[PDB]
Design a binder for these strands. Structure first.
Ligand SMILES: Nc1nc2c(ncn2[C@@H]2O[C@H](COP(=O)(O)OP(=O)(O)OP(=O)(O)O)[C@@H](O)[C@H]2O)c(=O)[nH]1
Ligand SMILES: Nc1nc2c(ncn2[C@@H]2O[C@H](COP(=O)(O)OP(=O)(O)OP(=O)(O)O)[C@@H](O)[C@H]2O)c(=O)[nH]1
Ligand SMILES: [Mg+2]
Ligand SMILES: [Mg+2]
Ligand SMILES: [Mg+2]
Ligand SMILES: [Mg+2]
Ligand SMILES: [Mg+2]
Ligand SMILES: [Mg+2]
Ligand SMILES: [Mg+2]
Ligand SMILES: [Mg+2]
Ligand SMILES: [Mg+2]
Ligand SMILES: [Mg+2]
Ligand SMILES: [Mg+2]
Ligand SMILES: [Mg+2]
Ligand SMILES: [Mg+2]
Ligand SMILES: [Mg+2]
Ligand SMILES: [Mg+2]
Ligand SMILES: [Mg+2]
Ligand SMILES: [Mg+2]
Ligand SMILES: [Mg+2]
Ligand SMILES: [Mg+2]
Ligand SMILES: [Mg+2]
Ligand SMILES: [Mg+2]
Ligand SMILES: [Mg+2]
Ligand SMILES: [Mg+2]
Ligand SMILES: [Mg+2]
Ligand SMILES: [Mg+2]
Ligand SMILES: [Mg+2]
Ligand SMILES: [Mg+2]
Ligand SMILES: [Mg+2]
Ligand SMILES: [Mg+2]
Ligand SMILES: [Mg+2]
Ligand SMILES: [Mg+2]
Ligand SMILES: [Mg+2]
Ligand SMILES: [Mg+2]
Ligand SMILES: [Mg+2]
Ligand SMILES: [Mg+2]
Ligand SMILES: [Mg+2]
Ligand SMILES: [Mg+2]
Ligand SMILES: [Mg+2]
Ligand SMILES: [Mg+2]
Ligand SMILES: [Mg+2]
Ligand SMILES: [Mg+2]
Ligand SMILES: [Mg+2]
Ligand SMILES: [Mg+2]
Ligand SMILES: [Mg+2]
Ligand SMILES: [Mg+2]
Ligand SMILES: [Mg+2]
Ligand SMILES: [Mg+2]
Lengths: 109, 37, 422, 120
RNA sequence: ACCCCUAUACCUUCUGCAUAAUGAAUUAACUAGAAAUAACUUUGCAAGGAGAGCCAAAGCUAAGACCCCCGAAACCAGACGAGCUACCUAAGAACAGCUAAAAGAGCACACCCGUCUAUGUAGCAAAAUAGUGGGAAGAUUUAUAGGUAGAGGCGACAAACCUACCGAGCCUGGUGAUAGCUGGUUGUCCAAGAUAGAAUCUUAGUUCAACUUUAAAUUUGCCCACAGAACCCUCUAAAUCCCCUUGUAAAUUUAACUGUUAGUCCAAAGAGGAACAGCUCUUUGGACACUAGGAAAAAACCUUGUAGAGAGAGUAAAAAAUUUAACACCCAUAGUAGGCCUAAAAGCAGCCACCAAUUAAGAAAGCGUUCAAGCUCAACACAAAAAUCCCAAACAUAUA
RNA sequence: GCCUGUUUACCAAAAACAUCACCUCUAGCAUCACCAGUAUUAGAGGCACCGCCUGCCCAGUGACACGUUUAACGGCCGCGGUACCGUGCAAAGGUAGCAUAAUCACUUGUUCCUUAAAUAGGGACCUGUAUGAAUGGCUCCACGAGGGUUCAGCUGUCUCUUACUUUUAACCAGUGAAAUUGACCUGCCCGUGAAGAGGCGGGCAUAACACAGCAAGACGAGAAGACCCUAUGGAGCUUUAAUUUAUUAAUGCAAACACCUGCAUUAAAAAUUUCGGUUGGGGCGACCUCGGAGCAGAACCCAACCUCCGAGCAGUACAUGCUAAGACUUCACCAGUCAAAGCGAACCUCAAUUGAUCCAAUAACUUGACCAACGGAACAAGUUACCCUAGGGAUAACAGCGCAAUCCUAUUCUAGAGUCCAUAUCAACAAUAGGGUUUACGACCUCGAUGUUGGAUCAGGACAUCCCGAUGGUGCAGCCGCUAUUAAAGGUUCGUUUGUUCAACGAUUAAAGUCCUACGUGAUCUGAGUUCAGACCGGAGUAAUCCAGGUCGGUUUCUAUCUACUUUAAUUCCUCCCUGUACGAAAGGACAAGAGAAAUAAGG
């Protein structure tokens, strides 16, 4: 009577924990729902996977959640929130390590 | 056998030893109070 | 078990089984009450199907049977089918169960279930096992190919106990053990009555159809508040004796019995054995009829047929006092047939007249003699008579030292008195 | 499921009664542990086996000297049910290069720096 | 010499064998690992090597070194078979006696057959003997010669018979058929070595992973401090991941491979079953498929493991404890037989009131009475049982 | 079954096959069968003498025709009303006959006869929705080593065995095998254990060897189990399984002027090959791929014929374009994911929502399988008991073993039965224990065999006692009883049907016990039942063949090497009397004591 349910695990979750050096483009965490939200220098794919937009150190923090005003469901949740209440979410940041570049003497004209 | 059984499940010998060692020992009041004034 | 029942009532038209006295609506109402009795399930669907050959294996014709099985299989909510056909034969039950995909119950099986589920007696359990012994086609709702070839094939030149041989052996052994246990329980029930018989208590069996008010009548007669009549069918499960006092100051046992049912093998119900043997050994039979019920004639016919089949003594059949209960329900009622006492058990209208009537009946039946006897005072003759015989009246002659006592005394007690105090 | 055991911190907080019983002052703690494997690693988890190998306690009843520092203490806490831990005592102080070849670890836990094998 | 103490043949197979699972009487002899690719080692020559061809961005050339045995029912081709048997062809032979009368007639010999019983069962016999029985002038039996041949013949169809074993003969050959299946696989010694899964006409197998082995290159491998890893869900576990130190010495990568991918119990979290199974299925860990000691014997419990000799020593785990049911003695008047109720129901059949006096007593906490009467209480005083035969012997007291 | 005959040589002799008779179909003809024959003939068949008959149906399939045919395959009903009055449907609604049948089950149908007693037999039935008419139906004369029943007689079949002769046997002499055999210095009990020990643990026993018997064990010898499963192992047979028509026969078209050849089409006959997997053994049923949620609370990953939900799209867009760092990855690979920057532009939603290679279509771009057995053979089903081989105790049936759901037993509870009264005897809801007799469930030993129902024979053991003994209670007046404690020394019947173990019945008994012992015991016996080979009936299927349906028949091996063993104060009934006494109102009716008789068992 019970059919299906044979699907294997997605192997989703965090691929880079805090303090891990991460290169640009590396996937930090794969998730089905928004468990960890994108922080600074972290981009989201179509499937909600978080990838490092810069080369640096991954840091997980708790930050206030301010959704986009056009996110109707979240805006409604906020509108129903009592005064003084602030939503918090777990954000993943990539603290860039190297500088954008250096100025080098190329020609002594 | 499940952890919860309708009968008293047999304990592993080390657990049995642990229970016997950690049995309650009442305080012996030296001289029995019954025959003290 | 929270079952869902389809009540299939074969309405017999023409030929044997055609009921002139009762109607299909009444019979299906009776079946609905029967199934409600068990506290577990209720009728989800009811179908009255015309049938002209009730004696055939399938009861119904080919077209009607196909139509019935069509609905039964189409409707999934049904868990079982109750066939208001008294008793089904084993082949009929097998065919109907296979066709309809669910367990099929008849009146006999349903009553056995009432006894087992309500009166959880060993008699009922053993009777259910006895009736359940025929066991094949375990997986209903589907015909299962089996291919039993090669199981227990000959090893050298012979084979061990095969299937349908082991089944036969188990069937025979189980039947024997159930019968032996039932015999033991019957012997114990007989043992229970030895002291009562020795004390020679006049014993009266109240018999009648279910819900006629046997329990209520016994409550009214005895005055016992512990007796609790109920509106449920087969409420008075198990047989019990209650003491009561008659206007002649006599003590009499009323045997509250299990109510009888129409279209039911009472002799083959083991739980009814106590009732049947108690009415057999009863000194008088009190036939309670609920004249208010529309099916009164059918109920009387069924009860009388059961009593006749019991092969009771001719004097016991005769003098059976008939009491028409529930007379208050009928606004104005007049008993046309003589020698019937109209009473209202709840309202206690004709109870005094009934008491006098069956008091005379007991005096006739038990053989006790009403007589005036002279006893010398201080002899303890008077105390002995007080204990061993009912004492209607006492008149002491102050001068003589004797007393004339009007007493109803049995032959045994009279002989004992004459010998003990010549 | 059977898993690695997390010992609550309160277990390793000595009391004054324990100090009196075992003769160790909370101030000025001992520097080195003498550790002896008194129990087999057989029938014990692979992690305990590995910790024993790391501590170098493969041979039973063979004393080994270890630092009394938090990390070594953590390993010893992991495998504490298989080992006997005692404080290394130096009645004559640390052995010098001159007497490095005359040392002996007495059963009391004292590393005497002179071993004459003669009656006192 | 035996007596003493210790010791559960071997091989194969298996989760696990003394196993009452396989093989083996024993001796002698015979009887079973064939090889490419790519690598590794060692030479030679060297941007070239090689005795045309081929390879080459250190290669090329040469050598060394890894790949078993027996076993089917089968399939097909060509021969050989009808001296047995099935049927037929030619031309022959036999059938006493009695009853009946020109008979697919009866009894009954010879003769043919083989109903039933016994014996026999490596027998006298690879189908018999003794008795018994069916037919015995016919569709009979039978001698001789001939014919029908296997994708076939023949058949009063019993899948009968076709040279003792016909669901389709036998021989030879293809053929050393093939077998994921069973069995076997022969000198010494050391070392490493039991690991998730996926796919599969696939779960008796195989390939890839994982594990394992070898060699080589390199540098981090394991343990692990904070900090850190989600809401749903109100609470919500043992833990885990990550992880510098630290204690350690391993790890990753490169090259070449096999074998294991049919598993048991124990502790723990669970699921199914019946909170059964020495049951089944996952997960963490342990042990076993290796040594030794212990729990009696003992794969899985406990102790302990790295190997030798010793007629030394300290130890590890390691021996079950329980024996259980007494109990008050005295005394009871009472307004009245509290009312109603009932034939009477009077503490004591039912309901309501349920007070009150005597020093002290519930309009009575239980028996009894037809109803009463009579006897008491509160109140005064004073654990287990089964089938061959129980199962070490015994012991309560000499200093842990 | 008409009969005489025939058949599985070597387990079935039969009811099976044939058979006269009847009937169906086909054929208008000669120089090798038919046949040296010619429609009263020949061949292919069905059924089965005879007697009465053989009913209705051509809708479907087949065949023949261009609609016919059932003595071709085959089929031959319902509904509503109260048997007949109407109606639906069909091709026709099973007609005559017979009927518990050799005819699914119910089944030991219900009756009468038969017997003391009958699951047997015979005669009957409002007896079959699974009887039934040349898939032949009834009747019947004869006949049968056919299958049942039976009168009478007969008898050692048996009650109940004994005696003797011969053979065998044992001893002496001559000659002289066979399977078997790891080695054996080869005991019993209990426990253990690979779940049944001569070898292991604890006990007990124990000089040594012969000879003759016995068959409880050596899971004894024997045949690499024929039962069951598995193998991408076979083969036989059937088809309406897949692929073909090479071959024949027809036709049509060519070619040649009917034959021959080539090409097609249709049949007949065949040929080759297959008959998935999982699976609490196999089968049936269900399932096979993908996604979400629990189991799996917290990085990841986790099984289940476990619990639940869903998917095999849809919508919007036409940059839903091109490129490219770095990463993830369903534990392999295949496949699947995310994506910075850049070019070119503007200024995808969705959990699943799918499928490789080859090969086809296309100019190309691209498209193609509910290949769902979803990592996908390009295309193949049944059945086998006529079976075969290789294995498997990896896997079922018997047995053992685990367990105790089921089963059985005992206590606790104090509601309720018991006129009153829980406990004389019981007992609901429940609780706590014990046992290992059942049905299971598990699949641990055994498939290079552990022979497995019932019976005979002999029995060993338990007591949870049926009888005999003692004892307490009783709703124990006596007689019968009921219940409980103790007791296993001894005993525990003969018959009818039935294979029955059992059951019923007949007659008894003091009683006619419940069990265990491989449901004791087949190297002691029997095989009646029982899913080997033959055959019939009913049913299923197109057929082969099949049915835990019936029924008739059907090969019972072993010379003993080892262990073990082979001469170890009795119960009960009845008769009289007590005694018509005690007891009892009567009905009835005892003990104890005493006397006498027997029956069985043991030994002579
Ligand atoms: N009006 C009326 N109703 C009555 C009378 N007697 C009985 N009843 C009703 O019928 C019911 C019968 O219940 P019981 O007296 O227990 O039934 P019984 O006669 O024992 O029958 P079973 O329950 O079948 O045993 C009563 O409970 C009342 O509901 C009567 O005299 N008059
Ligand atoms: N990719 C693909 N290949 C196909 C498909 N259908 C057929 N094929 C190819 O053809 C094979 C199947 O052959 P068939 O079963 O004969 O195909 P069919 O289309 O049913 O019939 P034919 O056209 O007669 O071949 C496949 O294995 C492919 O090679 C399809 O839907 N997709
Ligand atoms: Mg899931
Ligand atoms: Mg078979
Ligand atoms: Mg042996
Ligand atoms: Mg062996
Ligand atoms: Mg084997
Ligand atoms: Mg052998
Ligand atoms: Mg010949
Ligand atoms: Mg003659
Ligand atoms: Mg003749
Ligand atoms: Mg045949
Ligand atoms: Mg055959
Ligand atoms: Mg031959
Ligand atoms: Mg080979
Ligand atoms: Mg080694
Ligand atoms: Mg050592
Ligand atoms: Mg008192
Ligand atoms: Mg014949
Ligand atoms: Mg004949
Ligand atoms: Mg012949
Ligand atoms: Mg034969
Ligand atoms: Mg013959
Ligand atoms: Mg024969
Ligand atoms: Mg015939
Ligand atoms: Mg007979
Ligand atoms: Mg001789
Ligand atoms: Mg044993
Ligand atoms: Mg001998
Ligand atoms: Mg045997
Ligand atoms: Mg054998
Ligand atoms: Mg075999
Ligand atoms: Mg094959
Ligand atoms: Mg991956
Ligand atoms: Mg697949
Ligand atoms: Mg057959
Ligand atoms: Mg075989
Ligand atoms: Mg079994
Ligand atoms: Mg097994
Ligand atoms: Mg298993
Ligand atoms: Mg063997
Ligand atoms: Mg006893
Ligand atoms: Mg059994
Ligand atoms: Mg037989
Ligand atoms: Mg047939
Ligand atoms: Mg038979
Ligand atoms: Mg015969
Ligand atoms: Mg024999
Ligand atoms: Mg013999």
């Amino acid at each position: 009577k019970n059919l299906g349910g044979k699907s294997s695990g997605r192997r989703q979750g965090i691929k880079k924990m805090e303090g891990h050096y991460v290169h640009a483009g590396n996937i930090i965490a794969t998730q089905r729902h928004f468990r960890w939200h994108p922080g600074a220098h972290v981009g989201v794919g179509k499937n909600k996977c978080l990838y490092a937009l810069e080369e640096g150190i991954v840091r997980y923090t708790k930050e206030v959640y301010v959704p986009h005003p056009r996110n109707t469901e979240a805006v409604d949740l906020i509108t129903r929130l009592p005064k003084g209440a602030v939503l918090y979410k777990t954000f993943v940041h990539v603290v860039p390590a190297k500088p954008e570049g250096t100025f080098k003497l190329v020609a002594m004209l | 056998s499940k952890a919860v059984t309708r009968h008293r499940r047999v304990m592993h010998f080390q657990r049995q030893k642990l229970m016997a060692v950690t049995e309650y020992i009442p305080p012996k009041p030296a001289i029995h109070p019954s025959c003290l004034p | 078990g929270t079952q869902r029942v389809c009540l299939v009532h074969p309405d017999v038209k023409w030929g044997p089984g055609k009921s002139q006295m009762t109607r299909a609506e009444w019979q299906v109402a009776e079946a609905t009450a029967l199934v409600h009795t068990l506290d577990g399930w209720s009728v989800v669907q009811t179908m009255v199907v015309s049938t002209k050959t009730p004696d055939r294996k399938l009861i119904f014709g080919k077209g009607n049977f196909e139509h019935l099985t069509e609905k039964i299989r189409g409707s999934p909510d049904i868990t079982c089918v109750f066939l208001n056909v008294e008793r089904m034969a084993a082949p009929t039950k097998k065919e109907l169960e296979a066709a309809w995909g669910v367990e099929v119950f008849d009146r006999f099986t349903v009553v056995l279930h009432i006894f087992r589920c309500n009166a959880r007696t060993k008699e009922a359990r053993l009777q259910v096992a006895l009736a359940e012994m025929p066991l094949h086609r375990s997986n209903l709702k589907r015909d299962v190919a089996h291919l039993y070839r090669g199981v227990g094939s000959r090893y050298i030149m012979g084979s061990g106990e095969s299937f349908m041989q082991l089944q036969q052996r188990l069937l025979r052994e189980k039947e024997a053990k159930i019968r032996k246990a039932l015999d033991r329980l019957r012997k114990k029930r007989h043992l229970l009555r030895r002291q009562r018989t020795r004390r020679e208590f006049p014993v009266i069996s109240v018999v009648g159809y279910t819900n006629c008010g046997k329990t209520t009548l016994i409550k009214a007669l005895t005055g016992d508040a512990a007796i609790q009549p109920r509106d449920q069918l087969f409420a008075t499960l198990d047989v019990t004796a209650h003491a009561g006092t008659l206007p002649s100051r006599m003590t009499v046992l009323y045997v509250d019995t299990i109510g009888f049912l129409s279209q039911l093998p009472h002799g083959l119900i083991e739980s009814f054995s106590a009732t049947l043997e108690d009415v057999a050994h009863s000194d008088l039979i009190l036939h309670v009829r609920d004249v208010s019920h529309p099916e009164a004639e059918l109920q009387k016919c069924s009860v009388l047929s059961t009593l006749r089949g019991l092969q009771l003594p001719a004097p016991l059949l005769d003098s059976m006092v008939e009491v028409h209960n529930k007379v208050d329900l009928v606004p104005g009622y007049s008993p046309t047939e003589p020698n019937v006492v109209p009473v209202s058990a709840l309202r206690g209208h004709g109870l005094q007249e009934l008491k006098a009537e069956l008091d005379a009946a007991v005096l006739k039946a038990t053989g006790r003699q009403i007589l005036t006897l002279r006893v010398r005072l201080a002899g303890a003759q008077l105390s002995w008579l007080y204990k061993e015989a009912t004492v209607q009246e006492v008149d002491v002659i102050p001068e003589d030292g004797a007393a004339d006592v009007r007493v109803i005394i049995s032959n045994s007690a009279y002989g004992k008195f004459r010998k003990l105090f010549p | 499921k059977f898993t690695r055991s997390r010992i609550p911190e309160k277990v390793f907080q000595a009391s004054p009664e324990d100090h009196e019983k075992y003769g160790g002052d909370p101030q000025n703690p001992h520097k080195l542990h003498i550790v002896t494997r008194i129990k087999s690693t057989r029938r014990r988890p692979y992690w305990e086996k590995d910790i024993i190998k790391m501590l170098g306690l493969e041979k039973a009843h063979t004393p080994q000297v270890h630092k009394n520092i938090p990390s070594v203490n953590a390993k010893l806490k992991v495998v504490k049910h298989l080992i006997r831990i005692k404080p290394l005592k130096l009645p004559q102080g640390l052995p010098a290069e001159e007497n490095m070849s005359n040392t002996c670890l007495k059963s009391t836990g004292e590393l005497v720096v002179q071993w004459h094998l003669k009656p006192v």
